[PDB]
Amino acid sequence: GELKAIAQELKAIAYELKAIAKENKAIAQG
Amino acid sequence: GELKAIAQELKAIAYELKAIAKENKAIAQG
Amino acid sequence: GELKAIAQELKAIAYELKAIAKENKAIAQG
Amino acid sequence: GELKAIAQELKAIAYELKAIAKENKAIAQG
């Protein structure tokens, strides 16, 4: 149901934030 | 209902974060 | 209802992320 | 109630994102 769908989307959000963290570290280092 | 609305907005949020990840990747590439 | 209120704030969050993506792209293209 | 508390925290999150959008716009300008 929709509570699972909500959890799944939060999982996708975490994945994108992890990607942003990675790029911003690269920006800090460069 | 409203739980689906919440799921759909989280989907939109993930989508915008994907876009930020992309632009930051470009910024990190100089 | 508060569930609708939650959905509405998530829509606002998506909107602000969209704006952030827009500015970061401009930084990128700049 | 806790659902209202969640809505309120989301409102605080939207406010901080709006602040970030404003600063990134400033960065883009400069």
Place this chain on the structure above:
Amino acid sequence: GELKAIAQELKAIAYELKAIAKENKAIAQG
């Protein structure tokens, strides 16, 4: 309860976003 746990995590999230807004403001002002 878990609804309280959710509110508490959102509070932590708002806190981190406030930290990011602070740093981006500093970047903007330079």
Place this chain on the structure above:
Amino acid sequence: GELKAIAQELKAIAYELKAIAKENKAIAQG
């Protein structure tokens, strides 16, 4: 329960934001 799952994903989100805050501070001061 899915409510616990949601709380746990929000915890992971707070973790990633903490990392972004750290990197943006380095960008600011670096």
